[PDB]
Amino acid sequence: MCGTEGPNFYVPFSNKTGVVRSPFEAPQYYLAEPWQFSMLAAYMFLLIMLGFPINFLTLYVTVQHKKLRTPLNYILLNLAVADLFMVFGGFTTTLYTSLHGYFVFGPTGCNLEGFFATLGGEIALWSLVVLAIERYVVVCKPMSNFRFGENHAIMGVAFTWVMALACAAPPLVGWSRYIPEGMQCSCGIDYYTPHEETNNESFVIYMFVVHFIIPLIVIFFCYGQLVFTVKEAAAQQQESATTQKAEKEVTRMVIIMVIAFLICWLPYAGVAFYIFTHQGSCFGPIFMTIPAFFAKTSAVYNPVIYIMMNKQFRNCMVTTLCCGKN
Amino acid sequence: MCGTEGPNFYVPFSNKTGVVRSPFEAPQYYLAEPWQFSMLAAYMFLLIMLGFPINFLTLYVTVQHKKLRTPLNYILLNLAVADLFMVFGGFTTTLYTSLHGYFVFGPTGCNLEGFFATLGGEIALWSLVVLAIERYVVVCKPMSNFRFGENHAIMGVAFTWVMALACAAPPLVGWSRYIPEGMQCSCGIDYYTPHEETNNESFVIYMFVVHFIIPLIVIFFCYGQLVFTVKEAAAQQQESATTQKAEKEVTRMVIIMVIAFLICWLPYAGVAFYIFTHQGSCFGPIFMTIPAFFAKTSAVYNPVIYIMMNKQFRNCMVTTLCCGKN
Ligand SMILES: *[C@@H]1O[C@H](CO)[C@@H](O[C@@H]2O[C@H](CO)[C@@H](O[C@@H]3O[C@H](CO[C@H]4O[C@H](CO)[C@@H](O)[C@H](O)[C@@H]4O)[C@@H](O)[C@H](O[C@H]4O[C@H](CO)[C@@H](O)[C@H](O)[C@@H]4O)[C@@H]3O)[C@H](O)[C@H]2NC(C)=O)[C@H](O)[C@H]1NC(C)=O
Ligand SMILES: *[C@@H]1O[C@H](CO)[C@@H](O[C@@H]2O[C@H](CO)[C@@H](O[C@@H]3O[C@H](CO[C@H]4O[C@H](CO)[C@@H](O)[C@H](O)[C@@H]4O)[C@@H](O)[C@H](O[C@H]4O[C@H](CO)[C@@H](O)[C@H](O)[C@@H]4O)[C@@H]3O)[C@H](O)[C@H]2NC(C)=O)[C@H](O)[C@H]1NC(C)=O
Ligand SMILES: C[C@@H](O)[C@H](C(=O)N1CCC2(CC1)Oc1ccccc1O2)c1ccc(Cl)cc1
Ligand SMILES: C[C@@H](O)[C@H](C(=O)N1CCC2(CC1)Oc1ccccc1O2)c1ccc(Cl)cc1
Ligand SMILES: CCCCCCCCO[C@@H]1O[C@H](CO)[C@@H](O)[C@H](O)[C@H]1O
Ligand SMILES: CCCCCCCCO[C@@H]1O[C@H](CO)[C@@H](O)[C@H](O)[C@H]1O
Ligand SMILES: CCCCCCCCO[C@@H]1O[C@H](CO)[C@@H](O)[C@H](O)[C@H]1O
Ligand SMILES: CCCCCCCCO[C@@H]1O[C@H](CO)[C@@H](O)[C@H](O)[C@H]1O
Ligand SMILES: CCCCCCCCO[C@@H]1O[C@H](CO)[C@@H](O)[C@H](O)[C@H]1O
Ligand SMILES: CCCCCCCCO[C@@H]1O[C@H](CO)[C@@H](O)[C@H](O)[C@H]1O
Ligand SMILES: CCCCCCCCO[C@@H]1O[C@H](CO)[C@@H](O)[C@H](O)[C@H]1O
Ligand SMILES: CCCCCCCCO[C@@H]1O[C@H](CO)[C@@H](O)[C@H](O)[C@H]1O
Ligand SMILES: CCCCCCCCO[C@@H]1O[C@H](CO)[C@@H](O)[C@H](O)[C@H]1O
Ligand SMILES: CCCCCCCCO[C@@H]1O[C@H](CO)[C@@H](O)[C@H](O)[C@H]1O
Ligand SMILES: *C(=O)CCCCCCCCCCCCCCC
Ligand SMILES: *C(=O)CCCCCCCCCCCCCCC
């Protein structure tokens, strides 16, 4: 008897006291104090104030500067759009519902907010996977006679959408489902209930393999071979100080990006391992939602790492922000 | 009968309904809805998350990099400390009281939070005034045989403290007073009550002249002469492209800083002019507090303009953040 159970939701709180209400009808102030909902709102406000400008500005400086519109940068524009999906589909909606103490948009806004918030995070995840593959192909040159072109970059973007739809769409059709999560103010895939009517268990395994394990392997393989290829070539030209500097900075950026991915990826693995073991105990609204809580920050630091730390993007943004000067 | 009146406070709400309570005892939810207090909390959280790192990091990179510890930069360290006073003395306290709906620290925490929050904003104001004077003396060279030294920079910092104490201390001694302001969650100088026991009217005139008009004149005079002196000298060396570039960027930075000062300064003048005229009508909790609401942002954008846009500070912060590399 961990929580209270009903049609289209699961409240992580026992109803032996009789105080539990529908997360669509009444505020869930037994899960957390009202000020904790306000701090959830403050967190959403922080993410919106930092997440929209950075991501929208990536799309804006690309319009003003011709040198940014290269095929290898298409996946970064896709990343910026994905974060805006997280910012408006997820963070903005949650800020509004948080101040009500419950998900005021009903069971259908759950499918809406859940889909778009899940889609944005999925598109961002695979955009990092695709960017890893694209850079691997360009540097390591695995294909004998291959040139990365505009059509190849469009496929990579379309591939993220297919993979993101592969995760976000089944819950609408009958494989898993969208229910309020955590403090019941935002919606997402139901990892919290073994709902046999929608075969939730099979969907969690599918998510764990296809959308969790595979992205880590692909990212680790591609960037590993890239750093190996770069260090191998620089070893053949140790007379060039620039090549040695270029090798150092490429390695350092790969380390930064891989550490960044792990910071978002490990909390899910740690919590899941703590649920694989310690399986018996009940779970408050912060058991599996703690990884998701901090993963929202990726909408801010991912553009900082991949776009703001890009050399050309930075100069173009400085020029754009400064009315064209400096 | 604009608001309700009592010992040590003035609530901007009529008590004909009988619902008004002491801003020290009970929440002021007739001034604003609970979610509006939460948004006040979210605003404080945004200012804290942006204001503490930027300002503390100014103090931190100065410790790691010897070239930053120049006398002309002392007033910028004073500015960073001033903003931390605003961040901890003001923003942090307000975030806590906001979630209670009233000033839970009583009439004495009013004198405490009011003093330190007023002191931080005053130190920052005069630090910009002193930096304007210091740069004017160094560039325009008004004194015939003068060299700006370490002792001269220490006087400039001490001068800001004397001026800031000249404003923040009288309310504790009997000239004006500290009362809850706006939504009664933060404390400050009483511009809202003609309290004849503390001669509030004379203090407002004193603040308007010494701490509002004079800082604008000094800043406008110093930077005007500086831009004039720089453009005059560059006109004598139009063969030097760097001098012309240096003149352009100095002028552009002065414009940025003066526009920034006006953005913080004009709303006070606009509201005061709208109170000088239209004197009869009553005022909600957002009449004179709207300038103060947006002036809190100076704790974030002032370090961005004066420190983050400094050439040496930027490279030192990048090196410090990047564990010493790049
Ligand atoms: C967590 O657990 C709590 C407690 O069990 C659940 O809350 C209860 O939900 C039931 C509905 O299933 C509520 O029962 C309904 O109450 C209505 C109002 O009752 C009050 O008002 C009447 C006056 O109209 C008073 O006389 C009465 O004493 C109550 O104070 C009634 O109108 C309903 O009556 C109808 O349904 C019943 C069958 O349930 C029929 O017998 C009637 O003839 C009539 O058709 C009904 O009694 C109950 O009041 C709720 N209790 C509390 C404390 O809120 C939550 O639903 C549960 N949470 C989740 C998520 O499931
Ligand atoms: C805005 O305006 C409101 C309304 O005028 C003010 O709120 C009132 O404040 C007064 C205090 O000045 C309150 O009066 C006191 O109420 C106490 C509680 O009364 C209730 O409970 C008793 C049972 O104990 C009931 O019988 C009664 O009907 C009430 O429902 C009393 O204990 C107090 O009595 C003492 O003082 C009076 C003199 O004031 C003596 O005659 C008594 O013998 C005894 O010594 C007193 O009556 C009043 O209740 C408040 N009203 C409301 C609605 O809150 C706010 O103070 C004002 N705001 C500001 C900032 O000034
Ligand atoms: C993009 C988003 O949609 C995706 C997700 O939210 N996921 C739910 C939790 C997840 C991973 C998938 O973690 C699990 C642990 C054990 C079993 C199933 C699990 O699914 C995700 C993928 C990678 C990262 Cl770095 C962060 C989030
Ligand atoms: C540092 C802070 O302490 C100072 C202040 O808060 N002030 C209260 C309002 C103030 C100015 C002084 O505006 C008035 C208008 C009419 C009469 C009296 C007035 O006082 C301040 C000075 C300059 C600026 Cl840019 C912003 C704030
Ligand atoms: C680093 C600073 C951490 C501060 C944590 C503050 C946690 C406050 O916690 C709150 O305290 C109130 C009493 O003060 C209680 O009434 C509330 O129920 C409780 O949630
Ligand atoms: C910019 C963000 C705006 C958010 C508006 C939040 C409005 C909350 O609305 C409040 O919800 C409560 C239930 O929790 C009700 O009891 C209150 O009557 C209602 O005012
Ligand atoms: C480094 C990889 C970046 C991908 C970040 C995606 C984070 C998405 O986080 C996800 O958000 C969904 C909707 O809010 C929730 O349903 C999921 O529980 C949560 O894991
Ligand atoms: C998929 C993630 C792969 C990350 C590969 C990081 C490999 C780091 O490798 C290290 O890089 C340093 C760079 O100066 C060198 O000094 C070290 O000798 C080298 O071992
Ligand atoms: C010590 C601080 C720990 C903070 C962890 C809080 C985790 C709360 O859980 C959160 O509940 C919200 C309700 O809608 C969801 O939107 C978030 O995705 C979820 O992470
Ligand atoms: C740009 C978007 C602006 C959104 C402003 C939302 C203002 C909401 O305002 C709130 O609406 C609620 C009903 O929805 C009422 O119950 C509350 O009393 C009211 O404060
Ligand atoms: C990190 C910020 C922590 C802020 C903690 C806020 C605690 C608010 O505490 C709440 O105040 C209400 C009065 O407004 C009381 O009615 C509630 O009983 C009390 O829980
Ligand atoms: C460009 C000049 C920067 C100075 C910014 C200082 C802003 C201070 O703002 C002041 O804060 C006080 C305490 O919060 C309040 O009492 C005052 O009403 C308010 O004007
Ligand atoms: C105290 C505030 C003084 C601000 C002085 C700003 C003077 C701007 O002056 C302008 O600067 C431009 C720079 O390229 C020149 O092109 C213009 O000819 C010149 O008039
Ligand atoms: C359209 C949005 C306008 C927002 C203006 C809100 C002004 C509220 O007024 C604010 O009240 C607070 C109560 O402690 C004080 O801390 C702030 O200094 C004061 O500016
Ligand atoms: C040139 O590239 C710079 C042009 C001038 C921009 C300076 C102002 C930037 C302000 C950014 C900080 C805003 C703080 C808001 C905090 C809520
Ligand atoms: C070198 O100068 C950079 C070193 C690596 C730093 C990259 C990570 C920076 C993260 C900043 C963004 C944090 C976002 C948090 C949002 C709440």
Curated annotation (Swiss-Prot), chains A, B:
Pfam families according to UniProt: 7tm_1, Rhodopsin_N
Cytoplasmic topology ranges: 62-73, 134-152, 225-252
Keyword set includes Metal-binding: yes
Residues with attached carbohydrate: 2, 15
Sequence ranges on the Extracellular membrane side: 1-36, 97-110, 174-202, 275-286
MF terms in GO: 11-cis retinal binding; arrestin family protein binding; G protein-coupled photoreceptor activity; G-protein alpha-subunit binding; guanyl-nucleotide exchange factor activity; identical protein binding; opsin binding; zinc ion binding
N6-(retinylidene)lysine modifications at: 296
Localization of this protein: Membrane; Cell projection, Cilium, Photoreceptor outer segment
Key words of the record: Acetylation, Cell projection, Chromophore, Disulfide bond, G-protein coupled receptor, Glycoprotein, Lipoprotein, Membrane, Metal-binding, Palmitate, Phosphoprotein, Photoreceptor protein, Receptor, Retinal protein, Sensory transduction, Transducer, Transmembrane, Transmembrane helix, Vision, Zinc
Organism annotation: Bos taurus
Outcome following mutation: residue 15 to D: Normal light absorption
Positions carrying N-acetylmethionine: 1
Residues noted as binding Zn(2+) in the record, renumbered to the chain: 201, 279
Record field: transmembrane: 37-61, 74-96, 111-133, 153-173, 203-224, 253-274, 287-308
A GO biological-process term: microtubule cytoskeleton organization
Subunit and partners: Homodimer. May form a complex composed of RHO, GRK1 and RCVRN in a Ca(2+)-dependent manner; RCVRN prevents the interaction between GRK1 and RHO. Interacts with GRK1. Interacts (phosphorylated form) with SAG. Interacts with GNAT1. Interacts with GNAT3. SAG and G-proteins compete for a common binding site. Interacts with PRCD; the interaction promotes PRCD stability. Forms a complex with ASAP1 and ARF4. Forms a complex with ASAP1, RAB11A, Rabin8/RAB3IP, ARF4 and RAB11FIP3; the complex regulates Golgi-to-cilia rhodopsin/RHO transport in photoreceptors.
GO CC annotation terms, alphabetical: cell-cell junction; G protein-coupled receptor complex; Golgi membrane; membrane; outer membrane; photoreceptor disc membrane; photoreceptor inner segment membrane; photoreceptor outer segment
Tissue expr: Expressed in rod-shaped photoreceptor cells in the retina that mediate vision in dim light (at protein level).
Cross-referenced CDD domains: 7tmA_MWS_opsin
Protein name: Rhodopsin
